[PDB]
A paper describes a structure:
In the absence of a bound alkaloid, W63 rotates to occupy the hydrophobic binding pocket. Alkaloid binding leads to the ordering of β2 completing the Bet v 1-fold. Alkaloid binding and subsequent ordering of the β2 strand causes C59 to be buried. S-S bonding is potentially a key factor in the ability of opium poppy latex proteins to bind alkaloids and form dense aggregates.
The contiguous latex includes an abundance of related proteins belonging to the pathogenesis-related (PR)10 family known collectively as major latex proteins (MLPs) and representing at least 35% of the total cellular protein content. Members of the pathogenesis-related (PR)10 family, also known as Bet v 1 or major latex proteins (MLPs), belong to the wider ‘StARkin’ lipid-transfer protein (LTP) classification with diverse physiological roles in plants, including sterol trafficking, lipid ‘sensor’ activity, and modulation of transcription factor function. Using a combination of sucrose density-gradient fractionation-coupled proteomics, differential scanning fluorimetry, isothermal titration calorimetry, and X-ray crystallography, we show that the major latex proteins are a family of alkaloid-binding proteins that display altered conformation in the presence of certain ligands. Seven antiparallel β-strands cradle the C-terminal α-helix with the alkaloid binding pocket located in a hydrophobic pocket between the central C-terminal α-helix and the β-sheet.
Author numbering:
A (entry chain B): 7 to 36, 41 to 47, 58 to 156
B (entry chain A): 8 to 36, 41 to 155
Amino acid sequence: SGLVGKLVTQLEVNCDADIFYKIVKHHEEVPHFFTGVGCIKEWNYVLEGKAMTAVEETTHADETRTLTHHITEGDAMKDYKKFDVIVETNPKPNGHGSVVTYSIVYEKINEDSPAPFDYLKFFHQNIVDMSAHICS
Amino acid sequence: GLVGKLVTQLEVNCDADIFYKIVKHHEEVPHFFTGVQVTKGDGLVSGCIKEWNYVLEGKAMTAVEETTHADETRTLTHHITEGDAMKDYKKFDVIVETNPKPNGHGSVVTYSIVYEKINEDSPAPFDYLKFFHQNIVDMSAHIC
């Protein structure tokens, strides 16, 4: 037991859901502007001060405001047999502002593998960083 | 960004109805004050109010926690109202759900921390999430 799991961080953001989805989507594809007009790509990042690399297949779905990253190889694969990251944006139930959900769906390589709390804080911080460019 | 939710979900090998009973029993039962069981008025324990004593990253900690459950959804809720955990949060509720896998053998256990920060400089509860994750691991390793 304990090899298959999911970590989620969900944040409320005072921004329309479709607009925030467009900003997240554009930020990941490139950014001079905040908005822009399958796909395998390199993913280079710094995780708690350590530079890392990955290859990921990405998809997006505009109607559900969902970005998906399926990591196929790289530093994350040292601990995981499977590592998928999903970002979803949805309106708050009232309609003023939105809820942003980052999910990491993972399968550990073995029992001594960590669960990806370090990646969760990393993606959480991405939401915070982008939210900071939005005025209240 | 003051309102959010952190979630850890883990597949374990125990049966869902059994795992729910064990969690529920551990949380509804030597302390500083004597915990109390509560009832809705039918000869059934509906919950408990008690001291939660725990160690979080080296520091001993304490809180007042009220537990409620819903045997039908196999859902348990920890409602924390004062103590160490309330130093960063205006709201801190922990929801534990246990559901069978599709094949019916083993289950999926979900801990969700529903939190509201005091201000923007408050951390999100990643330390608590790792603590609760290890509790799932520890509990299942004890169940045959």
